[model samples]
Target: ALGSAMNNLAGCVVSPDVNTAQFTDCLLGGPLGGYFADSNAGFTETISNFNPKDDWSRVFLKSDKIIPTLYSNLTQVKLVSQNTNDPVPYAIAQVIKVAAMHRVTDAFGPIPYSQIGANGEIATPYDSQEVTYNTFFDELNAAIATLNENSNEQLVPTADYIYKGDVKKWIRFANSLKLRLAIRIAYANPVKAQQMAEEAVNPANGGVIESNADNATWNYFETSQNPIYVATRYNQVQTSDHGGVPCLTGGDTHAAADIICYMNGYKDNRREKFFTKSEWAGQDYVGMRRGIVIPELKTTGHKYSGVNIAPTSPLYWMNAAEVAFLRAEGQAVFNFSMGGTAESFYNQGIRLSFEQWGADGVEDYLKDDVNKPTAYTDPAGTNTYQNALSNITIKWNDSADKEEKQERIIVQKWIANWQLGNEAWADFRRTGYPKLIPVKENKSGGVVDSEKGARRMPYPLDEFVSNKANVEYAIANYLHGADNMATDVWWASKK
Candidate 1:
């Protein structure tokens, strides 16, 4: 009964016309660089790299697909193990789904639960944010137990995008997901957060993802199969990349605006490598803004349209460094290890993004910025982060201005969530950082958006029409539709 309400609460801005693939793409392809990516899209310039920065789609691509994959892979693993007479293929799909779904729920809030991916519940009922969060923990804790248990030495998913048949790694991801859930909602259940995190982080508790190798991810192919980059290539719009390079497939999303500005401010070398302002086939490239949609097919004469994400890199779900950051957060809270603080995690996150983007130019790029934002990045006398971390800051316990503190915390986590909008959207909903401003002007003529900003997507109308009983229960419990899309804040987010 708590599906759409939960989505509404989380400030999820569903598409007036849903971009499901694009939505899933958002998580798979992320603005991992934080405001760097977000702003790149905003400013209409290619990022230091020519990659598109539609963080929403990027985030979805990075995130949503994982749960579905786990469902498929694990079930397949079970069937295969039963057929092969081996027990090694039993990967924990339940744990993976729980973890992945939380990212979805937290980012979008009050999404359809109790009825998703079901046989006759296509437009299932929505859940309430309160109940959804409770369900997340319930599923997480229960799944963790099953994951920790040693049953058969079989049932592995060889085609698994992550870990490649390693049950242990799945467990690690499961455990890490558990910690993440607790930490993410620390505001709601502080005692439980501390207790659960402490137990999960303990090696004996069977926690998993411990290194970059164990990070969950998908590979962005160099070919059409990889969705991340293909979005740009296939996009019919001949828009410019953020860096002023003409995007071939209507690449409206140049570099995320903030990223371009930041990189330019620092003269990041990679920026030059990523985008080119030169015209391609006579259409000037336009940088990607937060929501730079191609003009109507009729308006642009069917020249360029659609959002595409080309994932031709080592994509990810959760990385080891992410765990390290979690460890750091847990540690700082209760005297743990300081192996990967915000700065270190931020730097590593960038390093990973750069490497996956087919380049790794952090040191040289940061050094080359002639128009550095502050002297901190300046060479001679003032290195703000000298022997410190990347500029993305994370202060779990800072009480500075909400904006400043949130910028620091969420941005760092933003980097932490490589190629995933799950965390970014979660942060946006929970702490409201990176203060995103949606496109004010649209062809819809302002009827679609609200002044406060579009938040939860309207419960899929199919639910109210079909699945009458269940959908009704969910709507009554979840949506509380007195306010439009912009007004709803997920329970955790209301803080």
Candidate 2:
């Protein structure tokens, strides 16, 4: 029964349709500048078109449903079966629950957490982000402790998507996730962040992901294709006009000019693996700038570089490179005990990223400190959007100030995290590093600042309609502001 629940939840968690919605939103909305929406297209063409009531609701709704079911299953097992009292599955379920809900709370701020599914209530009250995060810590601590106690037990191999039921790797991922969350809240809660971060890397708590081999990724089976591949490569639709004339062109997604500009300027060897050269740019890897109304969708928009993911590529949850960079940031900014110096961890992160991507020239890439990100130029010459992304270089500088070192670590982490846009967006919101290009247009009716980007997605309209009183309470007390895009999450708040 535990194996059955694990398989069921894993299926929903990695659903391709849901991922396409979430991934596209993050790519176009985040600071990574990895996607562009054409103005003439029928679909979303600007950041303003982002609707939390639609695709964004899928993430929250899925979690709302699955978390309760998992919790109920655990309760049922405890009540009915004495022999099936294995704590490993329950712990694994707890980890999966955290992994799912963090994305929820990160996107919308306060969500129903501590009291989720309590008394089988239909309308659950929301927890403040601080309380929500603290609950996360408690839950993770319990999960890690249970897993540690059952270290020799193995999950059913066929049911687990990531790590293939490897208990040790799961423990490592839990620790890594704890560290990630700790650093996320560092600015808001310094002492607590330090304590949690130190505890996460204390060596006594197993260890964090330190190798490419242990990356938490969802491998695509023969039954399903990678959703990112579908979004980037095989995205096209058939439609009809007013006269019933058939049309074939529908793909609107493209690599954004910001990332390509930085990579092109730095002569990044990973560019080949990340994107393809624009056919219209005469051998240059060009990208489309966001929030532009291109008249010719196919001739102009499709010509920009497309993402290089294949259909069979695995979807990444977290990677060793990101963990290394997390440690580097913890050590650099807070002077935490992260098992190594800031520079060593930062350099190791770059090396690990290169190894993971099968890219070359790591030694030279590390040494080339002078090549900063170059200014972007529109390949079509129809729009003038030229700005240097950042002056931060690749080489680790021991003499740099703490701010500079943090920026350096985040810049590389952002690059290494490639297709993972939500985490990059969160990092950018929290640290303001790597200097992403501002959107070409601000169509949020002044709700979201163009420079700061979308701080946090608005609460879904469904929540207001379905759970009005509780959601209203969350907005009034928990959010402390209007339910809009400009409002920052708890960790993202500067005040």
Candidate 3:
């Protein structure tokens, strides 16, 4: 039953229904730096309009199913353990639960956490983001302890999609997640962040992700398709099929100018893997600017670079490159013990990212400090927008100040975390690194600052309707402000 439940959870996350909504939300609202092409009319307008109140409800609804299923599975594992005398399954479930819920709490300041599955309550109470994160830490610590005690036990291999029941790799993933969360709250609570980060890196805790081999990814199997690929590359809406027309139209989402311009300026070799060449930019890897009123969707928006993903590509949960960069930031800014100097970890991060993406020229790419993000030019000439997104270079500068060094680390990390927009958005909110291009239009009617972009997603409308009282309490007591895009989460630094 636990294995079946694990399979269900993995499938739910990568399902086309859930993944497309999550990916589009992060791309438009988060820091993945993408634009919604107006070519698809309603499909594009739904995202570009910045209406999280209704359109983003599906993402939270999916969470409603996922969190309860996870809790129920954990309960089942505990009950079965009474007979089997094995604690590893329960521990593994706890780790997976944390990995899933952190994304939820990070997006919306407060969510139902501790009160979930308590006495079969219909209206699950919300936990503040700070309290939720603390609970996550406690859960991770207990899970790690249990896994260490039952190191020899094995999970049902068939049920595990990521590590195939490899207990040690799961431990590494948990520690890496702990480190990521620690770094997330560095500015909000430095003391707790430092202690947690140190615990994550301590050899006694089994170490964080250090190699590409141990990267946490949801591998597709048995007719499962990569949702990003389906949405961007292979969607029927983007392709026509009548009398062998060979129609090749663009999807609603396109790579944003911020990322492509940076890669273009740095001559980063990963561009080929990350995006397709823009026909509008003379076959150059150019991207569209967000929040613009695109006039000709086919000629202008469709011509921009689309996300380069295959149908069967694994859904990346986290990677070793991100872990390396996290360690770099921890060492550089907070002086955490990450087993190496900031420079060493920074360089390792670049190398690992290159390895992960099958890109070349890592040595030259890292040392090219002269090239900065190129200024973006509108392809269709409809919008007169020209600005270099950032001046930070690729190479690590030993003599640079703490802020500069931190930017260097974060810029590289942002580049490496392509397609995983939510994590990048979280980092950008927390650290304010890798200067991103602001939206071309301020569509929020002053709710979300165009310069600051979206701080956090609003609580979904379903929450207001289904769990009205609890949701109201979270807004009043936990959020402590209006429930809107401009309101920053607990871990995010107030500018």
Candidate 4:
């Protein structure tokens, strides 16, 4: 029973579901809410939040535990031990653990992967990012091999919230995740990335998440509510009020115009649902420029426009749209066989994104390549960047050069990948797509430049205190410098 409870707790927090209420409730809700609630919590400090002047201490100190907390909860379950004799359940737990921790390593470039949970050790040494990515491939592939070799049915239907005891879906989810990491490290470790990417697309290795039914997702209930809503909007366990808020304004969190400009310019139907018009932006689907002064944004930010992200929103962990895009990039850029041309997969990505959002017009929208991202003209005029971010047209012209084609692929990907701020940030660092406007004023001073945005987030204080020597080792060996946002992660691209 304790193991089951731990599994559920890990699931809820890792995926940001209804059960995630347990995390906020236990850590920062109620009397403790005063610490992270109101304007004290720096949830908006993230690049996703698009605010520059937000308190970084809150983010680096408080929010850093989110992933470590996930590791603790999942480790407590010991899914493999409970089902030691059953390969099916063992593989399921392993994949779930991988899914949870991959995000953690991504949050901080290098992490304690191979050395996690060392017996009686007060601090764990960090794994090189290359080793970490390679480990994901090996573990996921091993799990796939195990599942394929076994003929047993899922024994823990109630515990497996993602696939509901469907082992086949789990296999596909694992492959999809492997493909994601493979693409991420293409520049960092081309040889290994190529091998993994090819294996991911090869039909023999548990085919990727190609269809919507196979999407890796977590559901929520009105009773549990979306955890993001719980943290930013709602007040308590069962009620919906503006009492336990963490965001700066009730409706101030906005999309970056980097995405909205493309969607609006292309007249893509996904635009309206992605972001709404503020009276400040005049019916146009405008978004806030990232890294801006908070006071300047009081009248400037656009409210989140999606209805599905309310208290009853379903937290999407992975989707077919993203898988389609990854496959497209793998084939077009990395020479992996996607069973189709780059254009085919690119169009498919757009179609899948539209289908996922219940929007239409992809048919006509694909043929229109004349439109490109317009210069972001803020109504206040203080933040307007006159440079056109990208000239890569919507229509995939077979004749475009390699660099232009890459811009086209990543720009659409940046648009299709909504609500996943961390992944988008990683993509920006890895590929420099969709050409976001630099901050009006860079807060990192010499650490992070306005021209070059954040490379990786600073290691949390948790590491500094618990694993000081090992963390410093990572700084010297892998980071190539002290721990800061300006430091390039191992896989981060210079292109």
Candidate 5:
């Protein structure tokens, strides 16, 4: 039972066609009710209909049964491996759990961590987000050290996607992820977050991601064709938001108007990389209003450009540009030892983003501190809501207000993040940057404030059904409110 479970979740981790509905909807697509679901037809309602059980709120994007089961499997690995003398595979498994479970916690706040791996237990109690996060730090720190201790161990190169059995690069990827998590708590737990961030970046502490070559990505075979894409657009399905290609032209979904507005304001050529020309507007690049309702959604479906998806698109586990932005934030937020001025790091982030997309003219674009994001005017002639998102300029202004500089950092980070919607949503909850336009209909029954957006996704319905006692304990103590979307996580409280 345990061995089989391990094989299943590990496969799911790297396989894009498996349990990554959360990935497609959370990162690549739009909000809970928008993005993939549009049109009065099934394509619109099936994707748009927000149910806490199966849609965006679903804990398991593909299936809920394995949510606890995967964690249990990792715990089983840790139990069997942690005490063994072979440090490399042990550390590898630990990092894998950290990477995997962090996504689990990031989706929902509190999760079962410290008490996992125990067999025959009918219920596993939940850990506070604080406990879970510190556990990440401790386990990763030890794992990285252990990998260094046994660096010569042989592991199959093809078994992994990010590092290809290169333990050193795996260590770097772990540290990079640590850096990302560190900044997440910068506002919530400034002191420890700063220490962790500095340690991750400092040379002595297993160094951080420095280049695009070492980005943590999961590559898909041309044969499999990314399950999310297969489900939405295929020879069989024929139901896709962007006409299934996710390119600018012949795509049903468009980029968010906010994304288009920022790119247009800077005259960013990367806009073309992200989306196609809007045939509705005579070759103009266009995007959809993020929170628009269904009546408006069907008419505006093909009016906007879609994400740059195709057989070639890989799931970005993490990117060097995002790490650069985190470095920028570290320097800006807490004066951590980021090794460069916040402005320099911020510019480096922008350059890395442009370079990642193979976009040129970054040298020229960097000098323009004048271009501010213009308000998004939906070209569909139906919904005409336009407001300036922010006044922070493109070029790093050393003399800008500290708060303003943070906003500028976050805005760039959010944009560079692109299809990584979970990170974008988390960042939005924390800093309220690059203000998203409110949805036409607030779906959380006033539980999720339209202006502030949701702080965290609601707990999975199954947790309450099966683990009622522990779920109630989490809601009463950690959630700060009833089990609902409006409740903030332990570390996600607004600064």
Candidate 6:
């Protein structure tokens, strides 16, 4: 059980050392491999390598993943694996798995859950989307009850890529994750979520992470000795653009024009000074649709002009803001019947999103008002909210329309969830906010590629080839013949 993408989460976002922008969409269509030309579409576009000759396998590794083997090894190899001896440890591992899987599915869509570790059961039966939702709660409930008891057991998780053998952190992490997951199901299943969230958020239950210090990210090492960090270092070196290259964060690329424009309502340099040009600064820039050319398939040559670019922030796992945003939304959506206030939750979420990364990011962003971008202010911008309050997009809590309010909530969550939070994809699928638009949507390999596009990933190739029988059974009987990547997972369950 880990957090964030191992490599890109750290290396690419902040350091500008790596560039997975082109392959971002692969999680949508498929995983990355060698020779599949780059595109700026990142998480939006779809690309297929239809080469003349047969395409050979390319060793492509995404940093933002929890490899089944690695995760298991990390949990039990350290302590939880041998849970037959100490069940709590195993419980902890299970909780982590739930969190990791939640993120994975949210980003890539349907994945092989039953098939993930069933080495012998090659054809892992795919769980229905509805079942997946229930399972998340079930796992969290069980783990919370178990962890609450406080047990002492030890194991060496040699496989763990993130936190080596930090049992205390793992335990705390489980509870925190519990809170996070509860917030997720709030909209779909709010009642149970309220009970779980209240239980998890009580200060007694280690509460939730509020400071950057508690950020659940594993730092990357610049030197050897470490395997994951070393691999990360190498990748960064290969893609870095320091001087002429462009530098990791580039001379100036952190604030996406789109993002900056959104944040423009508030005057901070945090919005302008740091985000805007200090008189010397130039116009905004965006990367390519897929990190390639307007149409090219080469690995490089893609520039954003700035729709998407790297930020100089550290690797963020679960931040206070995200937690806050989730909490706010949870209160609004799930806790509403129990006295939930959409406005309160929305405002608190904004407050928390700002506070999550570092008090600094929030403080820096909230300064000044005179120079606030028209995106947030100005008559034209305000007029965009011509419809009912709910008609307004997210980030604008000012909306009164329930529909507009929901849209605003989803859009903000999606934007903040920008890279690491796979939930962005899931939320998009469920609510269809923050619409997915690549420079060319037709390029995506999935069959029904349109506004109501595919969200989940096909089962990994490895799963399909070996576990054909069970796979077929699940598809035919349970999943309605869902395609691995094509089939939508449980949470986005369509009734």
Output the number of the lDDT-best candidate.
Answer: 3
Question: What order do you get sorting by lDDT, best first?
Answer: 3, 2, 5, 4, 1, 6
Mind sharing the TM-score for model 6? Answer: 0.65
Task: Write the candidate numbers in order of decreasing TM-score.
Answer: 3, 2, 5, 4, 6, 1
lDDT of 5 by residue, 1-495 (tens): 333443434544434443355333432334532233232222332222322334545543224334454555665566656565455755776676676667667766887767754442325788889888999999989987887676666556554545767887877888888898898888788899988898888877667777888887765343456544443332221237446564333333445666777777778878877765664656466666644464333345655565566656776767888888889888876789887889888888889889988998999888887888777676666665667766667888888777888888888887777766667767776777766556655545556676776566667667667788987887777667666667777777665
Could you tell me the TM-score of candidate 1?
0.64
Error of 3 at 234 (Å): 6.8
Candidate 6 minimal-lDDT segment of 10 residues: 50-59
lDDT of 4 by residue, 69-112 (tens): 54555554455546565556656666776776666566567777
Please write out the lDDT profile of model 2 over residues 1-495, one tens digit for every residue: 655556544543444553443344434333233344333355443443433345443444444444455456545433323457777766776677777668778878998877767322336888999998998899889989988888888887864767778899999999988999999999899888888888888889888999999998876443477766665544432334213543222354666677887788789999988886666636468777765454455446656676777778887778999999999999998888888999899999999999999999999999987998878777678655666878888899989999999889988998898877778778888988768777655667767666777777777667777899999999999997788878888898543
Each model's number of backbone clashes?
117, 0, 0, 0, 10, 61
Instruction: Give the alpha carbon lDDT tens digit for every residue of 1-495 in model 6.
Output: 223223222232222223332223222212121101232223233332211111111101123323433344433323533544545545655655565556544543333565455221224566655466567768766766665565354335542334454555555666667776665566556576677777766766555655444556534523223221121222231244323453232221122223334444443222322232311124332222211122311222222222122232334455544555555555554443312355555555555555542235543433322332222111112112111112233344443455555566665554455434244545655655543232223434445444444445444445456767765666676555455334554445423
Candidate 4 residue runs with Cα over 4 Å from true position: 2-69, 76-84, 118-122, 221-223, 230-252, 296-308
Better of 4 and 5 by lDDT: 5
Assess each prediction's global lDDT (C-alpha) against the native: 0.44, 0.72, 0.73, 0.62, 0.65, 0.41
Alpha-carbon runs more than 4 Å astray in model 2 = 11-14, 18-40, 44-83, 118-122, 220-222, 234-250, 294-296
Question: Could you estimate the TM-score for every candidate?
Answer: 0.64, 0.90, 0.92, 0.84, 0.87, 0.65
Question: Mind giving the per-residue lDDT tens digits that candidate 1 earns over 128-163?
Answer: 766776676676666556556752332324344345
Better of 3 and 6 by TM-score: 3
Candidate 5 vs. true structure, TM-score: 0.87
Quote the positional error of residue 66 for candidate 3 in Å: 3.1
Clashes of 2: 0
